[PDB]
């Protein structure tokens, strides 16, 4: 072979830090570790992939399987070369042949692919790619559309039963059987991760840590291999295995020899983990699971988990939950926010140290307005979390709810406490007109809990008009947590039903309180935790707050609030 290196298996603790130095100056210590691991491995003979009757069976002449671990198909008599398919056995942290790393089937290979799944008794396919990327084919669609209901490739009959469609992955529940062979059908689980770019990396490591938690959860009735394929089967797939394995390896020895495990992989299939970015990714995955761990109760076991999470037997100490809140970062000066700190703009902030990050501040097609873009459960949908308008910005405010096409506004504050103004009053009884836009409220409905106001907006661009709803919530001073939650909830429902839900930076919702973080964070949270409690019966309060804390400063910056989420999410699900 060659002269690689000898890296020191990282121990749990120092992981966080090792990572830090390994990445200083655009991580050359990493670019080195990954640079030394050879593309292919000279020795290991690759004679069967190259054969002539198998040329068309490969997706890239660049990626061909070693001969000793190549997955084999029941040699069809006569038809020479029917034992070959582009796939390869891969070893985990122990289980030899735990996975099958395979090239995305070709339209001409689709039948040999479902043959491998039947002959290998695999009942867990993990697709980490998209059939179409950049207008080029990266993988044929080897499955029936929920419509066709059932399609049979060759002698293998595939029928889909369920089709769940989450934010990053789509989980399908199939039933396959060989009808030319009296034997009974098998339940297959197919996951497709769509938030992963070819040769690239996802957005947040937690996304990867995410589907891992969920493939480990799927049932493998035949102790068969786990099919992990992508386009060539080496890049994104190699990376996934990396994490899965190295995690076991951590949850096992509190150490991790990534370098080693990659080299070990690169010995079974060429170019596995094809990018420095994916290399650095695997580490981050470990550094973050290590750091914050697994925070994601299931609606099934919510009340149990939370109940003990809240108790601290030796009271001279905090509760486990408190532990959690403390592990939660607080990006204090996390990123650039100069825009918000200009001379004229410092008088455009109800609060000087609650300025939007330059990285997400709402442009004012550009001018300034203290409002932050917030990520929504369903990507790429986004909502604005701004501050109650200032007696002088009331004009800009409407420009924003008009330009970004807001449909519903949620005001969590009163117009003013005692004598001091907590917010201005962007609305009047008349036909208030701010700059190019003209508002005109048409209705004002007061309820024991909130108050709905229906405005009709326009410009000199008349004979059109957009109707804008505003829900103002009362029972909730910037202090006491929402008085009686059960109704805070009802609000969130009625509000939700007025916004569409069809899925152009045109954010439909807009939420605000004094600084747009104080109590606006609690809201945004609840929103996503609810939309997830519905679509997956699962809930990760920690991570949700971690992305908020990351979006604008000031949100859920107190244990009282953090814990609040837990409470409400729970009482509204027995």
């Amino acid at each position: 072979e060659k002269q690689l290196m000898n890296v020191e298996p990282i121990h749990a603790d120092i992981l966080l830090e090792t990572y830090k130095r390994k990445i200083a100056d655009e991580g050359r210590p990493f670019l080195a570790e990954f640079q030394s691991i050879p593309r292919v491995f000279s020795k290991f003979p690759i004679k069967e992939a190259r054969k002539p009757f198998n040329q068309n069976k490969n997706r890239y002449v660049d990626i061909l399987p070693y001969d000793y671990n190549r997955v084999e198909l029941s040699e069809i008599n006569g038809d020479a070369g029917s034992n070959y398919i582009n796939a390869s056995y891969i070893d985990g942290f122990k289980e030899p042949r735990k996975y099958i790393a395979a090239q995305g089937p070709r339209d001409e290979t689709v039948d040999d692919f479902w043959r491998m799944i039947w002959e290998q008794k695999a009942t867990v396919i993990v697709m980490v790619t998209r059939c179409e990327e950049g207008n080029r084919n990266k993988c044929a669609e080897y499955w029936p559309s929920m419509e066709e209901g059932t399609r049979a490739f060759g002698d293998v009959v595939v029928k889909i039963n369920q089709h769940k469609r989450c934010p990053d992955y789509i989980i399908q529940k199939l039933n396959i059987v060989n009808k030319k062979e009296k034997a009974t059908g098998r339940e297959v689980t197919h996951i497709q991760f769509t938030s992963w770019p070819d040769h690239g990396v996802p957005e947040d490591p937690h996304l990867l840590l995410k589907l891992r938690r969920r493939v480990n959860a799927f049932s493998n009735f035949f102790s068969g291999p786990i099919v992990v394929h992508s386009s060539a089967g080496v890049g994104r797939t190699g990376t996934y295995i990396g994490i899965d394995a190295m995690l076991e390896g951590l949850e096992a020895e509190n150490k991790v020899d990534v370098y080693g495990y990659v080299v070990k992989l690169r010995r079974q299939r060429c170019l596995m983990v094809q990018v420095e970015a994916q290399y650095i990714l695997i580490h981050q995955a470990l550094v973050e699971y290590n750091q914050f761990g697994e925070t994601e109760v299931n609606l099934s076991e919510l009340h149990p988990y939370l109940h003990n999470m809240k108790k601290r037997d030796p009271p001279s100490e905090p509760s486990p939950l408190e532990a959690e809140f403390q592990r939660l970062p607080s990006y204090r000066s996390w990123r650039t926010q100069h825009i918000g700190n200009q001379e004229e703009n410092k008088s455009k902030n109800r609060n000087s140290n609650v300025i939007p990050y330059d990285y997400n501040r709402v442009p004012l097609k550009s001018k300034y307005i203290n409002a932050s873009f917030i990520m929504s459960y369903w990507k790429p949908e986004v909502m604005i979390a701004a501050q109650g308008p200032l007696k002088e910005t009331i004009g800009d405010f409407w420009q924003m709810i008009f330009q970004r096409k807001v449909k519903v506004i949620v005001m969590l504050t009163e117009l003013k406490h005692g004598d001091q103004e907590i917010c201005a009053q962007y609305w009047g009884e008349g036909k208030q007109t701010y700059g190019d836009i003209e508002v005109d409220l048409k209705d004002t409905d007061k309820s024991s809990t909130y108050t709905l106001r229906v405005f009709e907006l326009r410009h000199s661009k008349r004979k059109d008009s957009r109707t804008v709803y505003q829900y103002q919530y009362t029972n909730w001073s910037v202090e006491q947590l929402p008085a009686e939650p059960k109704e805070l909830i009802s609000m969130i429902q009625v509000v939700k039903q007025k916004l569409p839900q069809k899925n152009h930076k045109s954010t439909p919702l807009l939420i605000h309180c004094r600084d747009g973080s104080q109590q606006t964070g609690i809201f945004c949270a609840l929103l996503n935790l609810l939309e997830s409690a519905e679509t997956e019966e699962v809930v990760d309060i920690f991570q949700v707050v971690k992305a908020l804390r990351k979006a604008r400063l000031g949100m859920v910056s107190t244990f009282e609030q953090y814990q609040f989420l837990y409470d409400v999410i729970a009482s509204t699900y027995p």
Partner: peptide, 6 residues
């Protein structure tokens, strides 16, 4: 043809 890694 078509080289994966490019």
């Amino acid at each position: 043809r078509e080289e994966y890694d490019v």
